[PDB]
Amino acid sequence: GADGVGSSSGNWHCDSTWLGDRVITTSTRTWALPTYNNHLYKQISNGTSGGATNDNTYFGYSTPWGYFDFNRFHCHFSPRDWQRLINNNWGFRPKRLSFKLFNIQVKEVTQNEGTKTIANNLTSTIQVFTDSEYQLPYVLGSAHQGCLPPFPADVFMIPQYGYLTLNNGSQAVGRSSFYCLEYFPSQMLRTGNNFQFTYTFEDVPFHSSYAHSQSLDRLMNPLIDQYLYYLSRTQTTGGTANTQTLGFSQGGPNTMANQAKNWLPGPCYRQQRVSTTTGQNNNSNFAWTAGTKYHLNGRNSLANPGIAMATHKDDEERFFPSNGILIFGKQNAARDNADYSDVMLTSEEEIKTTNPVATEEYGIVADNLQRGNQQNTARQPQIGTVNSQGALPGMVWQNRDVYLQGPIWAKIPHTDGNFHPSPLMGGFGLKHPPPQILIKNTPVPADPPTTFNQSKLNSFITQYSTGQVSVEIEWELQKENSKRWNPEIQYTSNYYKSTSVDFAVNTEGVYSEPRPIGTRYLTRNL
Amino acid sequence: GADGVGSSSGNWHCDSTWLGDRVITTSTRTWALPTYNNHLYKQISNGTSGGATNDNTYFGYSTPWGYFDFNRFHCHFSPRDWQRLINNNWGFRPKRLSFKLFNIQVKEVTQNEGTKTIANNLTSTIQVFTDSEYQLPYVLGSAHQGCLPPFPADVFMIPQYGYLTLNNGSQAVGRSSFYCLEYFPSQMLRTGNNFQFTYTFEDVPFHSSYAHSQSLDRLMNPLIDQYLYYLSRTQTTGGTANTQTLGFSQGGPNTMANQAKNWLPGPCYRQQRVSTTTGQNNNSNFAWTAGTKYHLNGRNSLANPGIAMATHKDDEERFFPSNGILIFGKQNAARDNADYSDVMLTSEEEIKTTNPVATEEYGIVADNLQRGNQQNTARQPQIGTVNSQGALPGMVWQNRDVYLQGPIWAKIPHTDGNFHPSPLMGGFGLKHPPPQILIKNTPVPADPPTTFNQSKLNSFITQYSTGQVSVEIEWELQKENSKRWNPEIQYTSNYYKSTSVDFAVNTEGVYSEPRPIGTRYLTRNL
Amino acid sequence: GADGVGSSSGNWHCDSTWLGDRVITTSTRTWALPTYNNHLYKQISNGTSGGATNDNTYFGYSTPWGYFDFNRFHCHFSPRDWQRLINNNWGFRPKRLSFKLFNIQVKEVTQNEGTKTIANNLTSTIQVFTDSEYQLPYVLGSAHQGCLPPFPADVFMIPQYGYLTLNNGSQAVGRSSFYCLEYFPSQMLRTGNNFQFTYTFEDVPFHSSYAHSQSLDRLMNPLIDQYLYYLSRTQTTGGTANTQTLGFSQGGPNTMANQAKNWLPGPCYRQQRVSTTTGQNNNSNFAWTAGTKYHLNGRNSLANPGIAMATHKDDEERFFPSNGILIFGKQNAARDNADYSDVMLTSEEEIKTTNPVATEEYGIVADNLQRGNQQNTARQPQIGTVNSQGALPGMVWQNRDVYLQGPIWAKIPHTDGNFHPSPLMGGFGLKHPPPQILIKNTPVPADPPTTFNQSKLNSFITQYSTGQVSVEIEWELQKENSKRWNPEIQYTSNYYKSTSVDFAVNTEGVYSEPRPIGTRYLTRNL
């Protein structure tokens, strides 16, 4: 058509459409983009000279660009839409997305004395491009702030793009890369232009939006015996001097721990157990010294949250792995040293059926070769505790649950090999994820001098931009086909009276999410 | 055409053609083939009676055949061609090969008194066949001598084919197989015939001809905080009597070791650390007693080189895993007890970014369940060191690098299951690799007696054969598409003056390779 | 389409595409254009009255226009792209270019009291035209500041156009020309218009992007003697009284300086030798008194850098010709009297093979006619040193190398004759080079008086302009086809750790180039 100062370049479109095995969520927000870094790229680093430990060293670059992040589930689903999803579906996955950037408004700020004036700059541009070839460091999938807000009426600030590369302390090495984002083709938009692009998700397995109604060690028939035998006795009984013997029995309903089985629980990487009753915990600061870590290039990193393991066993909801769960913060919680009442701990107890408990061992194996007292001195069988266990043939396991406040996807690192590349924070591991959209205000110089100077211009017009952003994702559903007789467990609001509605604004206009909501409510058989 | 004594049956073809995403290397050499084993098959074995340990016992057969081996990279690539490959390509893999055997010359040796005469035997044959059905023990892929020489002007001797089967000490068992290679269809060639065959590689992943410019624990945005919380404090501070508490923080730029992450480093099988400064090593002979071994049927075998792990961490190039690297020998180095200055140690430091260091642990896991002093005696959290770690979900890793002097492929054992079947010595794991070409001089009996005798003939005419062999491999390239601004690291010759040119002959005509050359020079993002 | 205030008239396009024998570099920058000279043309001159010497006199005109200059190699090539070029190609040359000027923003500045306000002037224009007929003095190709910056994120100021004509001291002569650039057809652009033009380079020889692996005096076979003889002796030996004789020998492997040869080294114009170790230089200020100069119309001009000669011989990297090399300045170096550590000296040592050393003589010639003592007094042969040598038949030579920071082209003067018209600063000599693009802000008068006045208006509205400029050049490549066995020399980054990445921004956002990069890394035979 005809795009100009006086015409609108897009419409507000926030909705959700359920149709068959599909649900299409569309979302629109209003953003603001400042000028970052004074239009400069800056080398950033952190060494041990300052006072940091070797574990927190880095070397990277801070860019003047910003980026869009809709990598949380509440960016697309309302709390009621999340309820329709998790109460009626066994699984879901993303199919394709559309992204739009419209109604651009570039404004200039003047500051004579103590007066601040904001006026339109009708001829200024913003630059937008997507990293469709995955040529920049991918910083989505690290659970960073700056998402599209969950409440459609909130206006958000676009976060600043930065990246890291190889370091040796605060220094760089020969393989450290430097990226200029102006070295990419970018689209320039004045107040009358808009931007848009579409993306198609690759085939990714459905998320397991269910709990198991059987456990792995209870797949048997509780009425029939097994025809296989197991060693049930190595020493006679009854008499006064018991001797060695061999005795075998058939596993039945009363001895189900001895029965022969076909499968094994998933892998284990044991965590430390912490109680929410502080009086039960040890009186020391063991959050880091006793943490569950991995070692990479002489640098210790917390395995957080780590592989998917059950949070606790039966009747022990007060225990959690020290760094083995996702922890969200309540509305307006401190950044550092928030109290327990200010955060919301998740719980993966739904996978007790196949996954080992995060704070327990995997099992028991033998240590030595037992013998009698025939020739050499008698030796008693020794056993060892398996606290870490990699993949064994015949293992089955579930992934970590996704949450309304949690991440959606992550980029699978480009490596030679990987094992079960599902992100450890939960979500869909993608070889080619949604590309990151980079955005920036084109610099506008102030009046240059009237005599030539070779130096680069460092005096600019103060500016920022505003506009709307809409993202539409189509999800595929996996409906449940269950013959269970009794009613299921569902997610529900509390009927009782209260001061405020959950998932609503309070008297000051602050929207908040009172609890985290997983997706495992319906049940399945193993 | 017309093949006979006076016409040539092939041309010398040693070259390399780069065209697009393909490179075609052709190579020709001159070989000599003796008579092996006096035309006999011989049972060979080694037991503990002789003085060998149980780890080195074997039972097998020594055959009179020889075999062709072009399973090193310098058989096909010149040092300059290797430089064109590793400086410009992110990956490569083999596609198809052609093999030719031509200009056969069978010669007979007579030895009257102290006189030695060598004359043509125009009517003698050689036998050639390829094990296209993989019915013989495959001895390629064990890094054996007898390759086509790297320098095209060198004449090489064809190695003798032998194989092993099951043993119990120096003895055999009922499942031990005996193979006669004369029980195969074979092609007989006189001085005017030639042999040829073609082969097509199966789909194999490209070799990672790059290093990572990011590390796994540094995929985050260094400017933005995380919205997820982690347990940062379990004990109050400041006061005189500190009590238990729970405190949570958000991971940010300054605490990147505590941030939530999606992935884990690759598996670990810890090695012993040895320094090239001998004064730093322990004063004992621990090369075998402290080696990193695996146990199979009561036999210990060194895990050499083992799974792909980083050789050392930053600033520690003097350390290597005791048996975790490929070690090549310099030109004319001893077979036994060569000094350190006579060998060339490789280094896989390029995979510090995803793979754990070979001489370090994998990480830390919990040992016990910590508790306070509410009821039972207080217990402090205990941690354990993970020195071996199998595959965990969310692991990523790189393979071992390939070298100019290193092997190309290996045959994947025919088993029920395998995990990431990439050869541990580096290269391409193939279910059906290039078949082994077997070659032999047909026996020519001396004058038999004039009265019949049933005994097999054990008097033959002394003979050997000569000819040329050409092998042409087509490789597929994977070009780099990088937006890195600063220059890359490249492999380069030293500009400074020297007594000899590297990768050239010296004054005596001896060709040598001064250093090993890997393939990871360009960089990528994770 | 529809061009106006609210629509963008161009997109940011900074990229490089390698495809076969072509590489296409595109580059976009943001510029600022002030009002120059108060919209006036001004006669400028410099005589000896002021204090200048006769060598620095001039007469010319300063115009109110500005011009665009992309005549350096870093305007188009990133440091990594320069590495892809010089490591893999024997030669390159430019083919065609595209130029675009878009997103024009004309702004007006008001200055009431101590307050400065910058507002859009939507109805103001800029004027742009290209000198496609080469009718103005061509000031590109004089290595002037004001290029498009090497770092795409830098905003640059457009330089002011001026020119010189004939002078006699500070005065002009009858042949001195005066040019008004308003006497050209020019395109006027408001904030919604854009400008563009294309250009095709003429056929120019490829740049020699290689070094020679042979030298001119070593093209012989080192094993065979020559059949030609040379005079090897003019006096008998051995006896007590030696007499005159004639003795001839054949040139062989041991006397290669006496062998007959077909060619001669290139021309010479000897320079003065300066050491970078200051203690080795003479203790006097000889930079100008001992400089290597040419004389034109009673005016001395430094021959800088002069004809292409080798910088130094073997093992003498510390010596350079006093004014015979290109010298670039490090980031933020002084304009006058910069120390040696603030500049980067180039070195043309790669042409030792065909070109004479800049600080050495060309050779030796005879001075007199030698004779004996038969009649007149005996005379000994005299020799003279050739310090300058023009073109001789059978000469071969290389041009000067091009650098990443160096110039690309120059305009060949329109004369009756020229010898080897390749610019002495390095690059491509073009009869019709890329035309210079002239740009200016159209003057906007302030309020004129209400009574008529014939005087020209000298009160204007303060103004400047901003916009983007994109230039795309297509280069043709000349791939190397070498049979060299050993690896080549390549340009590479240093692997060692460092405080900053080379060719990247520092902590303050300042981009810098640490060293000059030539193009002669691969090798050829003579």
Numbering used by the authors:
A (entry chain 1), B (entry chain g), C (entry chain H): 218 to 743
Reproduce passages from the article:
Adeno-associated viruses (AAVs) are small non-enveloped viruses with a size of approximately 25 nm. They belong to the dependoparvovirus genus of the parvoviridae family and carry a 4.7-kb single-stranded DNA (ssDNA) genome. In this study, we present a novel capsid, AAVv128, which was generated through rational design and exhibits significant differences from its parental capsid, AAV8, despite a high sequence similarity of 99%. Here, we present a novel AAV capsid (AAVv128), which exhibits significantly enhanced transduction efficiency for photoreceptors and retinal pigment epithelial (RPE) cells, along with a broader distribution across the layers of retinal tissues in different animal models (mice, rabbits, and NHPs) following intraocular injection.
